[PDB]
Design a binder for this molecule. Structure first.
Ligand SMILES: Nc1ncnc2c1ncn2[C@@H]1O[C@H](COP(=O)(O)O)[C@@H](O)[C@H]1O
Ligand SMILES: [Ca+2]
Ligand SMILES: [Ca+2]
Ligand SMILES: [Mg+2]
Ligand SMILES: [Mg+2]
Ligand SMILES: [Mg+2]
Ligand SMILES: [Mg+2]
Ligand code: NA
Ligand code: NA
Lengths: 133, 748
């Protein structure tokens, strides 16, 4: 139950890591895929995932199951903290403040561009991330 | 429900198994056909180029060649070195390049500044320097001709003749595949076309052939539970269907259509003149297979419900059909015998509406096209090919004695020697008149072929693609010293399955195109609103482009919207709309010389006009039979030039992405072995391997670059003393973009 941009990334990553294109991926590549999706699990969670996937004795993950795993893994993240680390990329001197003019440039120029109006309902990092969530 | 395919794709050593022998028989004399090896010959030419660079440096003639060509040489040598593992060869290449670099930073220092901007962006900076019409300046060949003062071998001469259009055809595999992939990116103005003494050279098909000749032979394995593998015993048709003349609705072909109380349709398919029973049992079993697996495969078509397969007395069939006004024509199709096999099934009314039916509004057409395109390509992934969706022929004049049997080849340039353009389509609207694409989805499912029959010397492939399976002959290929005819084409015996796989993809989309055009002509023929006619043709162009992007999405996982952007870098939807509307309607038959030229200028813009000597037929246009319109004049090419570019762009994006992914994971395995310790080497080598993986990521695919950035962070932690000034810029770009993504997505 995520955004369309996230689902699209999930579908292409699944497709890319489906080497022989039979519609399922080996659990052996689950670690690399999750890494590419910016939500690599802990060495404990991945073991719990390998054991959780080994219950039925099928180590081929089809997209329905794959989406379920990514969904709860992504939800097993601190949204406030992830956003914090994001702003922390545009603070190079390390003082805890990012430029305002810079944030407006990147979010409308690169990535999944936001439109000027949507960024204008959106500087102090620790605080900004704190109150946006 | 678990959604996945009963088909698996990998690689094998060769397709050249149980093929016709590589021999051409000419007037009783058997001429053996030999392959010219692609990779070995390519490498020989690059070696000669390197020795030519050596002579250029010694000659101190560098002052005499334009700066853009010096930059190309330098950037290519730097890209070549970075792709060369052997440290001796690598340093040999870097030594040949240093004199050029020394020269540039002194006499052409603004060009030198740009060179380092690209070097700081990529490990194969030559690919970004040739994202434009510089790719048409064949600097490598020009250097070889100026400094290699001796003849080329026959193999080499044959290579450069086929691949004269651009230096990229000499690049080693990863650099070519990466160049080809990024040449579609949004900062690329590269178009495989340049002008030649007023004559225009189109070499889009050459891009695909240079790619395919580098690939490994593919292999498809079907699961044991697959329709073509699992042993499903004889059909148990305990149930019969009582035909009543009062319920008969109409006849289409050999199929009796009966009404039901539920307002769907019961259909009785009756044996053709020379149709075996198997053809009817096969359609029954395929329908049952697709209904059973409809959820697994996410088949969107409204599938027919198979009911029975049993024998019926002719006399009974003739008694119930004798009312309909199709009676006489139906009698001519059914088998003469008095005991006729039949196939009974139930289907909605929309199953009998052909996808070109002019009574559909544009919104219903679009949805039905999407369903057909979807199912065609998911079922291709399932390992099922439909080679008889339509009856597209290039010609009927020499039909039986033609190697191609007159059947149209959507990628003819790749499947034959010295064929440069898609040819005339004979009676193009008639080809799709009874197309097996319907308002409801797919139909006529028993005329199917396992995908593996395209990778072997099946009856199908032997009948229609004998030239490709046998080899290339042309008088210019004859080597009198050996008495053999040599060509790069004969090398395709080993890879021909890869070629037919892509031809199937282009053929499906050609069927879609003709179906759309048949709809377009019929719905706009009696329209008096002229701007509205154009709007329909405009939207049909959108639907075609969208269908091509959907096919790419289904075969590669590339998001549909990016696939469309990639296609539109290469194919011009405006030209396509103008060309389809112009040539697929009869209006042009009413024009004279000066008006035709002006109209042609508008639909080809800068490119050459379509030339023909044919005498147009009034109210039809180009027509060999004087009744049905053709696409193209006699013995000439199809005028739908942008369509050809679009089909090649589609299959080149599919195949090029498949090979790009293969290079990406080869390099990824290498990066992970360096980061783990399996391969112990210095920090710069580690940084280089990771930077190269960045070059092998899909254009526009961020998560791939996120992964590569993560490898780069890990690499910096593994070599914490190593200077990283030469790589931080490009990865900081990825880092800031990545950070932007997370912020953007949270707001959503
Ligand atoms: N089977 C085919 N499918 C599509 N185009 C063809 C086919 N055979 C020939 N052509 C093209 O038609 C033109 C001449 O055909 P031909 O009459 O076979 O010499 C050239 O543009 C050929 O590339
Ligand atoms: Ca798989
Ligand atoms: Ca700061
Ligand atoms: Mg039918
Ligand atoms: Mg002919
Ligand atoms: Mg029909
Ligand atoms: Mg049929
Ligand atoms: Na795949
Ligand atoms: Na012809």
């Amino acid at each position: 139950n995520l955004t369309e941009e996230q689902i699209a990334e999930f579908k292409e990553a699944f497709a890319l890591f489906d080497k022989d294109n039979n519609g399922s991926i080996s659990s052996s590549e689950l670690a690399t895929v999750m890494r590419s999706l910016g939500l690599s699990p802990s060495e404990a969670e991945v073991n719990d995932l390998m054991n959780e996937i080994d219950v039925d004795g099928n180590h081929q993950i089809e997209f329905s199951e794959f989406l379920a795993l990514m969904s709860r893994q992504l939800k097993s993240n601190d949204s406030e903290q992830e956003l914090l680390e994001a702003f922390k990329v545009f603070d190079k001197n390390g003082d805890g403040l990012i430029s305002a003019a810079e944030l407006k440039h990147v979010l409308t120029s690169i990535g999944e561009k936001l439109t000027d109006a949507e960024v204008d309902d959106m500087i102090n990092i620790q605080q900004f991330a704190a109150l946006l969530s | 429900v678990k959604q996945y395919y009963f088909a698996r794709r990998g690689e094998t050593s060769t397709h050249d198994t149980s093929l016709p022998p590589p021999v051409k028989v000419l007037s009783g004399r058997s001429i053996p056909l030999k392959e010219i090896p692609f990779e070995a010959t390519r490498n020989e030419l690059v070696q000669i180029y390197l020795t030519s660079i050596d002579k250029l440096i010694k000659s101190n003639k560098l002052n005499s060649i334009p700066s853009q060509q010096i930059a190309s040489h330098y950037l290519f040598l730097r890209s070549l070195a970075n792709s060369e593992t052997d440290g001796i060869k690598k340093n040999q290449i870097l030594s040949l390049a240093k004199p050029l670099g020394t020269y540039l930073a002194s006499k052409e220092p603004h060009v030198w500044k740009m060179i380092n901007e690209l070097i700081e962006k990529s490990e194969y900076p030559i690919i970004h320097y040739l994202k434009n019409n510089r790719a048409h300046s064949n600097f490598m060949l020009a250097l070889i001709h100026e400094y290699h003062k001796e003849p080329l071998t026959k193999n080499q001469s044959a290579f450069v003749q086929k691949f004269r259009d651009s230096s990229v055809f000499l690049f080693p595999n990863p650099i070519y595949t990466a160049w080809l992939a990024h040449s579609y990116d949004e900062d690329s103005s590269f178009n495989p076309m340049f002008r030649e003494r007023l004559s225009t050279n189109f070499y889009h098909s050459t891009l695909t052939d240079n790619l395919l000749l580098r690939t490994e032979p593919k292999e498809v394995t079907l699961s044991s539970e697959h329709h073509y593998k699992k042993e499903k015993g004889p059909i148990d048709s305990s149930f019969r269907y009582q035909m009543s003349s009062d319920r008969l609705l109409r006849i289409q072909g050999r199929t009796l259509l009966f009404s039901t109380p539920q307002n769907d349709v019961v259909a009785v398919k009756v044996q053709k003149k020379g149709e075996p029973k198997s053809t009817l049992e096969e359609e029954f079993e395929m329908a049952d297979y697709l209904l059973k697996h409809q959820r697994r495969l996410d088949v969107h078509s409204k599938l027919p419900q198979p009911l029975g397969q049993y024998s019926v007395k002719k006399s009974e069939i003739l008694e119930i059909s004798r009312g309909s006004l199709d009676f006489e024509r139906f009698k001519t199709l059914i088998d003469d015998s008095k005991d006729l096999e039949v196939y009974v099934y139930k289907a909605p009314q929309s199953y009998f509406t052909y996808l070109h039916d002019k009574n559909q509004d544009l919104e219903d057409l679009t949805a039905s096209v999407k369903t057909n395109v979807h199912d065609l390509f998911v079922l291709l992934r399932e390992g099922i090919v439909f080679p008889q969706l339509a009856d597209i022929f290039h010609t009927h004049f020499g039909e039986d004695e033609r190697e191609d049997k007159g059947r149209y080849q959507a990628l003819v340039q790749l499947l034959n020697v010295l064929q440069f353009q898609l040819g005339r389509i004979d009676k193009w609207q008639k080809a799709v008149e009874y197309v097996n694409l319907r308002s409801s989805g797919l139909a006529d499912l028993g005329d199917s072929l396992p995908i593996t029959s395209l990778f072997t010397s099946s009856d199908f492939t032997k009948h229609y693609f004998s030239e490709l399976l046998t080899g290339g002959y042309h008088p210019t290929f004859f080597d009198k010293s050996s008495g053999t005819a040599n060509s790069l084409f004969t090398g395709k015996r080993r890879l021909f399955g890869n070629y037919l796989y892509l031809n199937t993809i282009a053929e499906y989309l050609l069927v879609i195109q003709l179906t759309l055009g048949s709809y377009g002509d019929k719905v706009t023929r009696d329209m008096m609103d002229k701007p509205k006619k154009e709007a329909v043709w405009r939207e049909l162009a959108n639907v075609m482009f969208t269908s091509c992007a959907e096919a790419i999405h289904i075969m590669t996982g590339i998001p549909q919207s990016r696939a469309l952007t990639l296609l539109k870098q290469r194919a011009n939807i405006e030209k396509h709309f103008r060309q389809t509307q112009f040539w697929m309607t009869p209006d042009y038959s009413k024009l004279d010389e000066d008006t035709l030229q002006m109209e042609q200028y508008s639909i080809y813009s800068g490119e050459p006009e379509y030339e023909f000597t044919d005498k147009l037929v009034s109210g039809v246009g180009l027509s060999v039979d004087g009744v049905h319109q053709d696409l193209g004049g006699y013995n000439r090419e199809s005028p739908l030039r942008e369509l050809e570019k679009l089909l090649y762009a589609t299959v080149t994006l599919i195949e090029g992405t498949m090979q790009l992914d293969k290079e990406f994971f080869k390099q990824l395995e290498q990066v992970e072995k360096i980061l783990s310790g399996e391969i112990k080497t210095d920090a710069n080598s580690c940084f280089e391997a990771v930077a190269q993986l960045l070059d092998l990521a899909r254009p526009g695919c961020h998560f791939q670059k996120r992964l590569v950035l993560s490898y780069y962070e890990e690499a910096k932690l593994k070599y914490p003393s190593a200077p990283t000034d030469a790589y931080d810029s490009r990865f900081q770009v990825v880092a800031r973009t990545n950070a932007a993504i997370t912020i953007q997505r949270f707001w959503r």
